[PDB]
Coordinates of C-alpha atoms and ligand atoms in Angstrom, one line a residue:
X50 CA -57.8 29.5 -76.4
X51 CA -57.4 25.9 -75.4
X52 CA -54.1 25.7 -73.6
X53 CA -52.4 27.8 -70.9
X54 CA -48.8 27.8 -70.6
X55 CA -46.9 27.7 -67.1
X56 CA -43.9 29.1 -68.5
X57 CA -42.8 31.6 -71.7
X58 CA -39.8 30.4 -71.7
X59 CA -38.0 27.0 -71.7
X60 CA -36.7 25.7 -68.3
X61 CA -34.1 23.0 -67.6
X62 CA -35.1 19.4 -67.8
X63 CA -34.1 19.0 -63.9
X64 CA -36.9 21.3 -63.4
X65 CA -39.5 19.3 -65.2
X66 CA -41.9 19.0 -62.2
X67 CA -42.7 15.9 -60.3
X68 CA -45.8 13.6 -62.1
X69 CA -45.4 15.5 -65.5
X70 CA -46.5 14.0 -69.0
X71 CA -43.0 14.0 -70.9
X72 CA -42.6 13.8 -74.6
X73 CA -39.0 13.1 -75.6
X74 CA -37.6 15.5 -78.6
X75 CA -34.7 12.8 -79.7
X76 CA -33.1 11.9 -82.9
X77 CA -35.1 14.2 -84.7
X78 CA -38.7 13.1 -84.0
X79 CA -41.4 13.6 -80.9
X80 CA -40.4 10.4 -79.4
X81 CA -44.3 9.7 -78.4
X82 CA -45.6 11.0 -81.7
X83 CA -49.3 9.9 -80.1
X84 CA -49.7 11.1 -76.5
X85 CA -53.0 10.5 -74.6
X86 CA -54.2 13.1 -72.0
X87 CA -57.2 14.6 -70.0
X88 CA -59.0 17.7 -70.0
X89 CA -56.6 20.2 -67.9
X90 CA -53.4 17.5 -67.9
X91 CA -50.1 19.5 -68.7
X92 CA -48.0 18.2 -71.7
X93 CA -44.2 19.0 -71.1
X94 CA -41.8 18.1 -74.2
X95 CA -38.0 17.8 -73.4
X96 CA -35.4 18.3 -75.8
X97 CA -32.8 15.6 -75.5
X98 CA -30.3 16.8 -78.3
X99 CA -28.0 19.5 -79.8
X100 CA -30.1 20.8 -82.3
X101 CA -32.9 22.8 -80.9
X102 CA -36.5 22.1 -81.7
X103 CA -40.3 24.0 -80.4
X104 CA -43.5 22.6 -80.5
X105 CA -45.8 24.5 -83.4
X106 CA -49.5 24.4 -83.4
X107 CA -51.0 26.3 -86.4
X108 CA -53.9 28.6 -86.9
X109 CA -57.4 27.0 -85.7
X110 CA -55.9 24.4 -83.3
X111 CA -55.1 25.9 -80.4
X112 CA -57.3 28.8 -80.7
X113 CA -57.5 31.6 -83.6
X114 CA -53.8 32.2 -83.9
X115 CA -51.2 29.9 -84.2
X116 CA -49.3 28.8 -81.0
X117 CA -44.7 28.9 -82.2
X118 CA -43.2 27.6 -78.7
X119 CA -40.1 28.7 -78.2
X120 CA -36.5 26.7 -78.8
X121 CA -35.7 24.3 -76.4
X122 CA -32.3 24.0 -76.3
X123 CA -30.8 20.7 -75.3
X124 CA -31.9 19.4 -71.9
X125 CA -34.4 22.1 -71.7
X126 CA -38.6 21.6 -71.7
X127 CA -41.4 23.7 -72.2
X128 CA -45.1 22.8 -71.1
X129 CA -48.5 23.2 -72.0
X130 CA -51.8 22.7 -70.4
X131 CA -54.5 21.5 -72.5
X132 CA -58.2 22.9 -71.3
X133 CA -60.5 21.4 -73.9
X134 CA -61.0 17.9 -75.2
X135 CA -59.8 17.4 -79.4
X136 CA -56.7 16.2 -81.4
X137 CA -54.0 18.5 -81.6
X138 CA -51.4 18.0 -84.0
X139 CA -47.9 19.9 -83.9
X140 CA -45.0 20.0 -85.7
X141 CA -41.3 22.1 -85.4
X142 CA -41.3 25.2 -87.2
X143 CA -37.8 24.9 -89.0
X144 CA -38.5 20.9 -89.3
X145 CA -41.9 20.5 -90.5
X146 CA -41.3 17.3 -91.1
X147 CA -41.7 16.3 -87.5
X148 CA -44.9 16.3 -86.4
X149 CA -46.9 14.7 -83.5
X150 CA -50.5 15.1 -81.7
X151 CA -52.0 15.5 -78.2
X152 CA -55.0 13.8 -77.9
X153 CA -57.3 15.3 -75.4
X154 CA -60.0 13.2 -73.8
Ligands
CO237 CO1 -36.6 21.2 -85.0

């Protein structure tokens, strides 16, 4: 497995913590679609709008099973920290169509 995740469950965006890597969810699309990190730097995407959206990385990505975030609601987050260099694409499980990638260096 090449993440960890500091919380299950989605928090509010208020409690996004201090220095974080933010990804806007906003008008249907990862609103930093390329995002460049370092090995151990926590990810946190925050949903800006109605409809809710996850983060979705499939099979062989994030490890050997698939990694389905849950909803975010709107004005809620969710983060990830990323513990091995590579490109990891996602996408949102009901909208497939949106996709973006974490590059790890
Ligand atoms: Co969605």
């Amino acid at each position: 497995d090449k993440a960890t995740i500091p919380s299950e469950s989605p928090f509010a965006a208020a409690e996004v913590a201090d220095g974080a890597i933010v990804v806007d969810i906003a008008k249907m699309k990862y609103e930093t679609p390329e995002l460049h990190v370092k090995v151990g730097d926590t990810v946190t995407w925050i949903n800006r709008e109605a409809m809710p959206h996850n983060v979705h990385f499939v099979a062989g990505v994030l490890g050997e099973a698939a990694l389905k975030g849950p909803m975010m609601k709107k004005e809620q987050a969710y983060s990830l920290t990323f513990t091995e260099a590579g490109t990891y694409d996602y996408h949102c499980t009901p909208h497939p169509f949106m996709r973006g990638k974490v590059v790890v260096e």
